[PDB]
Amino acid sequence: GRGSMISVLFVCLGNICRSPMAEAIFRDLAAKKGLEGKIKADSAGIGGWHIGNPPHEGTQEILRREGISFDGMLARQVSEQDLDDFDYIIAMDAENIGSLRSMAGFKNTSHIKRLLDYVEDSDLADVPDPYYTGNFEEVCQLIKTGCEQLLASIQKEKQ
Amino acid sequence: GQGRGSMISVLFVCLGNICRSPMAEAIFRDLAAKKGLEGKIKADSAGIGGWHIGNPPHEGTQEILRREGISFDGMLARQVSEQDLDDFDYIIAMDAENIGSLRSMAGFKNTSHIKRLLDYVEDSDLADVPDPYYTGNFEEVCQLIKTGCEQLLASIQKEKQL
Ligand SMILES: [K+]
Ligand SMILES: [K+]
Ligand code: NA
Ligand code: NA
């Protein structure tokens, strides 16, 4: 539209469960708002065990039932450069925040926030890691509402 | 129980290494001494960030420690490094952010020995020790760190069989 494309990076630990789910859901929400030419999403993980792999089967199953594509999505590890490239860096939990701030040397981190920061009220602050819980349904609900509220916040602030 | 064999080492980690981890270091050391474990367990602290390197603990923590009649002679802030991960048997973080920072630092190194202090208080929740550098509340940090160190020491005594 007017000016540069907005970019959003979702960050979790493995970049196989949470952040890919968020990337795909957010992308789908944006597409439906007709914003695909104005906002772009990616994800990445703090850790590197899963680099190059498709999302966890649990996340694939969730997305499939939502009818959301995830073709071509494959884990990658966040880098320092990502901090400069992306307008919004959206962590899943407090551990991820700690990782990102330390990577940034505790400088220029105002754009690094948790997904549930965008959900007013909200009992939870963290999206739990289902690699450990097994609870992909809970994650899906938390990520859906978080993405809806994040998109609205970006839509407001940037247009 | 146990100086019988190699010394067990515990590193307490917070953000600045001036408020929480020094308080935990001093308190935990005091608890270990009371149990007669000075010859078996050694504690240290360190911070994620580097703003306060070389400084003594925050005045609030000094005041708490004075009240508890616990010494902190020679305790001076330092920043945690990769080598600390391999050196210490236990790495005990004050909050989830601290854990995440240590994870970013670890690379391919094992991180299974990195836990939060209040993970050992089974089960309170509170899970995080609040940062009094920001909150201004040294009293609640003292209470949390006392109970956490008590449970931590008991867990180590059970695990290492003293
Ligand atoms: K990715
Ligand atoms: K220290
Ligand atoms: Na940026
Ligand atoms: Na070790």
CSV table of all heavy atoms in Angstrom, one decimal, chain A residues 15 23 42-44 74-76, ligand 1:
chain,number,residue,atom,x,y,z
A,15,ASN,N,11.0,-24.4,17.0
A,15,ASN,CA,10.4,-24.0,15.7
A,15,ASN,C,9.9,-25.2,14.9
A,15,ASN,O,9.9,-25.3,13.7
A,15,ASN,CB,11.5,-23.2,15.0
A,15,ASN,CG,10.9,-22.5,13.7
A,15,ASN,OD1,11.7,-22.5,12.8
A,15,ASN,ND2,9.7,-22.0,13.8
A,23,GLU,N,2.8,-18.8,12.7
A,23,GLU,CA,3.1,-18.3,11.4
A,23,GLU,C,2.0,-18.6,10.4
A,23,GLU,O,1.5,-17.7,9.7
A,23,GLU,CB,4.5,-18.9,10.9
A,23,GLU,CG,4.9,-18.4,9.5
A,23,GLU,CD,5.9,-19.2,8.8
A,23,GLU,OE1,6.7,-19.9,9.5
A,23,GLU,OE2,6.1,-19.1,7.6
A,42,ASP,N,7.0,-15.0,9.3
A,42,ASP,CA,8.0,-16.1,9.3
A,42,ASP,C,8.1,-16.6,10.7
A,42,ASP,O,7.5,-16.0,11.6
A,42,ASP,CB,9.4,-15.6,8.8
A,42,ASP,CG,10.4,-16.7,8.5
A,42,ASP,OD1,10.0,-17.9,8.3
A,42,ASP,OD2,11.6,-16.5,8.5
A,43,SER,N,8.9,-17.7,10.9
A,43,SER,CA,9.1,-18.1,12.3
A,43,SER,C,10.5,-18.6,12.4
A,43,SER,O,11.2,-18.7,11.4
A,43,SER,CB,8.1,-19.2,12.7
A,43,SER,OG,8.0,-20.3,11.9
A,44,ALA,N,11.0,-18.9,13.6
A,44,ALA,CA,12.3,-19.3,13.8
A,44,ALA,C,12.4,-19.8,15.3
A,44,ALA,O,11.6,-19.4,16.1
A,44,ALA,CB,13.4,-18.2,13.6
A,74,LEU,N,9.7,-25.0,7.0
A,74,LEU,CA,10.7,-25.9,7.6
A,74,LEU,C,11.6,-25.2,8.6
A,74,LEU,O,12.1,-24.1,8.3
A,74,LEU,CB,11.8,-26.2,6.5
A,74,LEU,CG,11.3,-27.0,5.2
A,74,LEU,CD1,12.5,-27.0,4.2
A,74,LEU,CD2,11.0,-28.4,5.6
A,75,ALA,N,11.7,-25.8,9.8
A,75,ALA,CA,12.4,-25.1,10.9
A,75,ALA,C,13.8,-24.4,10.6
A,75,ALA,O,14.5,-24.8,9.7
A,75,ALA,CB,12.7,-26.1,12.0
A,76,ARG,N,14.0,-23.3,11.3
A,76,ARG,CA,15.3,-22.5,11.2
A,76,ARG,C,15.6,-21.9,12.5
A,76,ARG,O,14.7,-21.7,13.4
A,76,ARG,CB,15.3,-21.5,10.0
A,76,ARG,CG,14.6,-20.2,10.4
A,76,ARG,CD,14.7,-19.2,9.2
A,76,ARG,NE,14.1,-17.9,9.4
A,76,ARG,CZ,14.6,-16.9,10.0
A,76,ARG,NH1,15.9,-17.0,10.5
A,76,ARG,NH2,13.9,-15.8,10.2
C,1,K,K,10.7,-21.5,9.9
